[PDB]
Symmetry: D2
Subunit: 432 residues, 4 copies
Amino acid sequence: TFVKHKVKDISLAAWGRKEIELAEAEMPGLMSIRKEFGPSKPLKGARVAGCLHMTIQTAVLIETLIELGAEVTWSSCNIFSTQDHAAAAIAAAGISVYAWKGMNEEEFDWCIEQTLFFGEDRKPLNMILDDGGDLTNMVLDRFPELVKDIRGISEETTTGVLRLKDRERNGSLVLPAININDSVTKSKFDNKYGCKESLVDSIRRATDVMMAGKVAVVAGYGDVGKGSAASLRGAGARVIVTEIDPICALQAAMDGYEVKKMADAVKRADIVVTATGNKNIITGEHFKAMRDKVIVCNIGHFDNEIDMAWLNKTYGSTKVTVKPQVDIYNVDGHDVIILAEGRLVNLGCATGHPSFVMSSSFSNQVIAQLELWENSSKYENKVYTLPKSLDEKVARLHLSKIDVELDILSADQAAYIGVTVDGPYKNDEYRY
Amino acid sequence: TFVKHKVKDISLAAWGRKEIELAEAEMPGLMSIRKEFGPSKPLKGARVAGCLHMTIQTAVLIETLIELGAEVTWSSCNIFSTQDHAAAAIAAAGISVYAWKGMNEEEFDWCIEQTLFFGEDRKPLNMILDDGGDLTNMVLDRFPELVKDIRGISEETTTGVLRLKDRERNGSLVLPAININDSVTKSKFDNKYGCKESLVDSIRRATDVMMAGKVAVVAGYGDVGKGSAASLRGAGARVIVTEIDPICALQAAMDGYEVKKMADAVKRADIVVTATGNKNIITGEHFKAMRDKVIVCNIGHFDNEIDMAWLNKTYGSTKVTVKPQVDIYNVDGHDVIILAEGRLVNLGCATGHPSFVMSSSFSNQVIAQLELWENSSKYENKVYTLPKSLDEKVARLHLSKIDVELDILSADQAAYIGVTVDGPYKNDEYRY
Amino acid sequence: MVDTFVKHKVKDISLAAWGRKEIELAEAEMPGLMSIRKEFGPSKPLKGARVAGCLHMTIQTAVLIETLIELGAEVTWSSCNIFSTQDHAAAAIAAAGISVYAWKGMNEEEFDWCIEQTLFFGEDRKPLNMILDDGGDLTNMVLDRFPELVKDIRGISEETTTGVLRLKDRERNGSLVLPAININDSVTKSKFDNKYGCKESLVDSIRRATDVMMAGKVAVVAGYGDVGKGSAASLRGAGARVIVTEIDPICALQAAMDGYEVKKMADAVKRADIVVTATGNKNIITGEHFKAMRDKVIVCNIGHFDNEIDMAWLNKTYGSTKVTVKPQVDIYNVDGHDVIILAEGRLVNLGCATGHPSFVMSSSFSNQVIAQLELWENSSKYENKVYTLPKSLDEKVARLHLSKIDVELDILSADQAAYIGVTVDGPYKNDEYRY
Amino acid sequence: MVDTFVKHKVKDISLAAWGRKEIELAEAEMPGLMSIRKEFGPSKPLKGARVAGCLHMTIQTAVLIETLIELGAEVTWSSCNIFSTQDHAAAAIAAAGISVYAWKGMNEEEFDWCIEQTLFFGEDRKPLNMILDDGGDLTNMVLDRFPELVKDIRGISEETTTGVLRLKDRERNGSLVLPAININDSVTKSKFDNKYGCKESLVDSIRRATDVMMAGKVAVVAGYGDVGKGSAASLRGAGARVIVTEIDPICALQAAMDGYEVKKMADAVKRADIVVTATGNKNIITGEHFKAMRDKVIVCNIGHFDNEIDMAWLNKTYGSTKVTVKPQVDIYNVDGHDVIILAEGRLVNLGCATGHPSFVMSSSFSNQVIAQLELWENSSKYENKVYTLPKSLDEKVARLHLSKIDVELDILSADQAAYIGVTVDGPYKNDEYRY
Ligand SMILES: NC(=O)c1ccc[n+]([C@@H]2O[C@H](COP(=O)([O-])OP(=O)(O)OC[C@H]3O[C@@H](n4cnc5c(N)ncnc54)[C@H](O)[C@@H]3O)[C@@H](O)[C@H]2O)c1
Ligand SMILES: NC(=O)c1ccc[n+]([C@@H]2O[C@H](COP(=O)([O-])OP(=O)(O)OC[C@H]3O[C@@H](n4cnc5c(N)ncnc54)[C@H](O)[C@@H]3O)[C@@H](O)[C@H]2O)c1
Ligand SMILES: NC(=O)c1ccc[n+]([C@@H]2O[C@H](COP(=O)([O-])OP(=O)(O)OC[C@H]3O[C@@H](n4cnc5c(N)ncnc54)[C@H](O)[C@@H]3O)[C@@H](O)[C@H]2O)c1
Ligand SMILES: NC(=O)c1ccc[n+]([C@@H]2O[C@H](COP(=O)([O-])OP(=O)(O)OC[C@H]3O[C@@H](n4cnc5c(N)ncnc54)[C@H](O)[C@@H]3O)[C@@H](O)[C@H]2O)c1
Ligand SMILES: Nc1ncnc2c1ncn2[C@@H]1O[C@H](CO)[C@@H](O)[C@H]1O
Ligand SMILES: Nc1ncnc2c1ncn2[C@@H]1O[C@H](CO)[C@@H](O)[C@H]1O
Ligand SMILES: Nc1ncnc2c1ncn2[C@@H]1O[C@H](CO)[C@@H](O)[C@H]1O
Ligand SMILES: Nc1ncnc2c1ncn2[C@@H]1O[C@H](CO)[C@@H](O)[C@H]1O
Ligand code: NA
Ligand code: NA
Ligand code: NA
Ligand code: NA
């Protein structure tokens, strides 16, 4: 059975298309890539299956791949992250998209499965574009017959990369993969500035809480945690950080944040944000220790950061939904407010990162797809990163929109520091 | 004809009631006032007509007045500020409310008129609680027969106060009025921290624009402008301020902001925010000078800050609505994005100020209503402010929720600085 | 029978050339004062005035002094604090022939003597006829100890929150026997000098004294008036985490809204790497606080007097352990944990660095000159009460500082001005406006 | 034929007591170094080592020196900058019997002489066998001018971005004839010292030199690497508005995302009240820039060498107008508008104040000691190439600084550790992690 697309409400397409146009202006990276590579159609013959939050921003990525000549199918990598107007606009353009806000797990899995075959004649995918490794897992674990004709994987996020490196270690990585999470222009921008933009946004939409006067706990101080703390502080919340890594903890301290163990920090929290990529950050002992009407949410990729299974089993009978993705539990006479059932809060309760920063991440994606499509045979079944020259190009593409003007090295200056005038400007160990 | 209430959709009441309960916990001022004054029903016999944004926060004010024994009727003071779930919850409680999001001007005026008479037997109002002076104007200009039995006015905002002071000068102020805008615990908190919380919130909901990398112009650097600049800077925008007052301009400069004339500033703006309480801040010359897809909005009380009449007359034929309260105009080949048709953006495109800060403003309102209801005969037909002891009490009521603990002066310390231990702590000229 | 005439007394008059160079640099950072010199200088409106000043003898104050002289005044001067004088500033003023009695590191007897010398001008001892004060100590000396001189004195101008409080007590008690202009409460003073000035100079002074890393530390600021607001901002801007104490629920709620934890001192002090008193009150830090402190806590005061910290208790109880690291940085061993005291608990910004920068002092001192002009010319139209300057002058002061920092104002049309109820050239706010 | 032995050379050895008091205070702010003293001191693992250091002779460096001695090393020392020495620190070190040759305000001949003395230990002239360098000038002297000494030297440790670049050029050219450990690129150095250190000390140094008001000013920072990031943050935290220049599109996009305007110097410099070079490159500020500047602009450099600003051009063209306000604050009249130069364009934080505070230097210097230990014991296992320290040691350094500032870590369970692919005691990040 061939289902051309599945979306919540296709009448939202006009609205979606208007926002896609506005987003295009905020995404000069992607648009510049369309101009540069569009005329040559370098992805003619490519059949790219994407599993990645079906947002307005993602719509621009999809249409960039199509302008480069690709066939494209798509699903979301999270049950609450799809923007239904974005999905509708993509479906109205004739594209095979299977995504809506508020799927269940069976629906989620079905959507990914549909993306593996293209058109009524069922031509299988030959490229994977993934965010979290769920599409990758479906193909490698459940459709291994399809790996022969697939040229490569590109992976968006810290958690999916970790899964790929485990596959590499275990000997089950049977395709080359490009890790674009660790492009400088992704990790140091998307994870950091993106969460800075969208964390507080999502908590405000969900709860309309006053930030000034509140204390918030952010678990983790990697790039997501750094940005999350900055989101909260910029809005006027006082932030306490938790960490396991002494270097990251010392960074937080130097950035002005108190750093304590969660067992202590959680007692003082009006707001709790998990940002670790790890599991069991917030457990039953934490829930029992919390202040009344604490707001608890997660901005790491999966919903195991918060022990929702414990919360639902133990206090599920008291659960009251205020509105979609804002649930209140009565834990022993004090309320706990859970956002998006502990799934990615920025995407679940608002619209995720803004278009401008996603243009950098998605510019990296297109470059990686181009590279594997053209050159997959020169790659081993291992995880790679993009060369610095391409990482620098991505940054360069975003400067003009925001009136950032660079000085140009003279030949003398360039020689003196051991670089060429057009870069790369830093050696490969440079941390920015 | 007696209409008991008029709201968009009364089935939103359950949702509204849940949020009202959450708001109650964020509003300890109002709740404390309920406990203190509720048992004595000091407003028994009062018939309070309110004209004030019909939000979740306002619902708590309304129900506070009822718990003090008042009859209450209500409308909104802005066509886009009502929260329909709040209005529905109030209507479901049997209260006469006439308010919905997206009224026209005829509807707006009708709603206010209904509030003047209470119940099927049409008992006229005897108290006025106003925000912007539109209810006051309707009674004094169009129902002057009703002034005899009305005991007083309380006024919420800088613009309504200015109208009252003009009436005082002109000799048309025929009731006593308490100006609660200029309670310290209102002006220095609501106008400042409130706009800090809700300005950026509203722009994000409307547009989902990246703030980092953008330049924003804020016109005016009174309390609203101070908070608006802080909202933007905290989110990562670079802010240029405009002013006419050299002191306020020098404040902005000392707070780190470039200060330029609008004619110059507007050319550099990704985002434009009017915060003056004045008219013709953004005119046709400004619109023609703007960058493509500039976002233009107003956070001052009325929609004359931006010359919408000029924009609609001249480029109205190009107008495209993206979604409600986000309109795009093509001004000579470059787009201008207008939020909420130039009306209060925080209330029009998001939910206005959060509950915690509105508890201070509305605590002042209740205190002023109590004071006029009981003691109106001791007042001349002039604008008054509340004594500092009551202003301090309002602040005191909000400290415990956010774990602010005061030291207590010893008798020796109190004598030394010339104050009593329980205050007032500052003389009346103190500016905070 | 025969009086001693000392022309000036300064630490080292050979520092004058250095002082003069910095005065010149300061002049460019003080457009308000310089503009006032040009406007009023040619007409010498202070001819015949003999102004005794008691006010921190800094480079900034040198510009004030020479502004008054350019307006035609005779001027004598002392410092209002024992550690606040900048010796090169004092030397430059002395080298210009002016009677200044001030140096860094006076004792109390020396302090009092210096003020006394300022009351009489030249070897022929013409008495003062104007008072320019900062803290009320000159005012107290004249009214309490030289009341014969009050007849010929026309007025007082007062610089600071603490001196104003003293004047209001005199007003209440019935001992204020001269008109006084309170320039502390010019908007362009209190909302700028006290706030942005302390923001600039608090951290500066702690760094010069101790060279401590700010990032990673916790600091307690007692008080959240204008000085406390600026002090907290100084620390936060440098990377310290700040806990505020207060007695005033409104000021406390401000601090909380500005992002600061607010607790009682008994609790706060246990967590403090750095303690700053900013109240204008007494007994903020007592023996119980000292015994509760962390090792090598840095304790200082930025309020006008050294009562905020109980130095008498600290010296009596643990003075035998005192070790001076360098001038104005003393370490006490309080029961096996060290307490570092800056400037013996006196104004830390002036005592351990150079106080507020020239740009903000130009506003405060522009207000001073305006007040001296007003009392000199019009003292008879004033009662023996404390006054403030009209808003039109407060606005003018601000206007004079805009061009240096490229602030440009929009101008209201007549239509706009009518709409908001103001004239085009101001004043733009009513008298109750709090900014 | 007969060599002169100078035991030490310092400005004023009577400043030792003051220096010692501040060293003690610094020791408490440097738990990393002190912990390293306790752990390794009893076993004297550096017995027989003769460590020549070339590194700013500050109070912080004194703690490093005495740490190496407590580990059993003989130590000689000079400064790597002519203006960076703190004379009381140098005096304390000399008073302890250590051969130090350093004072504030050397000339170039003096600078070179001081380094030369460090190569031989005691009157009997035992040559150095270890190099501890900051900028590569000691390394250059040994390799270029005393190559006979390379045989017995075991290794080099290098402190700073500029010295590392010199070592990598030697590596490429084939003239690196010793193993080198680059400690600049320990995470706990580059991401802390260069960034948070400059944040602490840039503004400090400008304030001490000029006492300028920061609020209301515009500053240009050239470069947005770690030093530039910290410099911009120093200025913004003090209230200055900062414009950044860059050549690297990624670093430029960072600055823009951090809220800074980013423009070409030709444009930026016209708007600047304050100019700071932070590139490690040459010719950032040239004659065309100087002619375009506002009157009394403050110009300084926080990159390692004085090439960033074209001081040769400024001195040749307008040197006849030069006026020294006080040491390391010089004013030039460039075509009728004044240019204020700090520390003759040399490292401003160290030249006009005291450089980075002790707490952050404890991390950098903990890395130094670890590198010296590693080369002393294990130099034979290294090629003549530049190395960095393993992440496990980089993490250990951080761990040692947590307790002083009350940072407490959560601990992974075995289950959590397995889940994220790490061991419970770390390392917690893979080697490509950028923090
Ligand atoms: N919501 C979004 O839009 C968004 C954006 C980017 C990345 N992500 C996801 O966010 C997560 C974090 O990404 P990152 O790039 O910051 O990874 P990272 O490795 O840079 O940061 C993770 C941090 O968590 C810390 N940590 C681990 N276990 C902990 C515990 N038990 N308690 C406290 N701290 C702990 C680690 O020490 C580390 O510093 C990943 O799941 C990633 O896929 C989400
Ligand atoms: N949106 C909200 O929720 C909210 C909250 C509080 C107050 N308000 C309203 O906001 C407005 C401003 O209130 P405020 O308390 O800041 O008043 P204010 O008097 O404290 O500030 C107004 C400022 O605008 C300046 N100004 C006037 N005309 C100008 C021009 N042409 N260009 C530039 N600047 C100009 C004035 O000099 C003044 O500093 C009022 O309409 C008030 O009723 C709205
Ligand atoms: N160092 C300087 O350069 C400088 C500059 C300006 C003013 N001052 C001086 O600083 C002091 C403060 O001035 P200000 O203008 O902020 O006065 P202010 O009245 O604005 O502030 C003092 C604050 O301290 C609070 N307070 C009083 N007793 C307290 C206690 N026991 N614990 C906690 N808080 C307490 C008050 O509630 C008040 O908010 C005055 O002595 C003034 O003369 C010094
Ligand atoms: N003062 C101190 O205490 C201190 C501390 C640490 C490092 N340093 C020194 O500071 C310098 C910078 O160190 P860093 O770690 O930031 O190095 P870095 O490589 O991290 O940063 C240098 C930056 O300057 C930029 N740049 C180069 N030429 C430029 C030009 N012409 N215009 C604008 N930008 C340009 C580069 O793109 C780069 O981003 C080095 O010389 C280093 O030794 C000094
Ligand atoms: N608006 C958005 N559209 C698509 N992906 C997003 C958006 N915001 C954040 N993300 C991505 O979500 C990922 C986590 O699964 C991050 O790696 C981040 O790039
Ligand atoms: N959530 C809200 N509910 C009611 N009034 C609000 C809210 N947010 C802001 N306001 C008010 O809007 C007024 C402007 O009309 C301000 O004086 C402010 O108090
Ligand atoms: N550099 C300075 N020169 C003179 N007075 C100063 C300086 N810095 C701060 N002050 C003043 O110190 C006063 C307290 O005595 C404050 O009112 C403030 O105006
Ligand atoms: N107080 C200080 N003492 C010693 N070295 C310092 C100090 N402050 C900064 N530095 C060092 O100066 C070096 C540049 O030569 C930087 O690598 C930095 O580590
Ligand atoms: Na978005
Ligand atoms: Na709200
Ligand atoms: Na000064
Ligand atoms: Na130092």
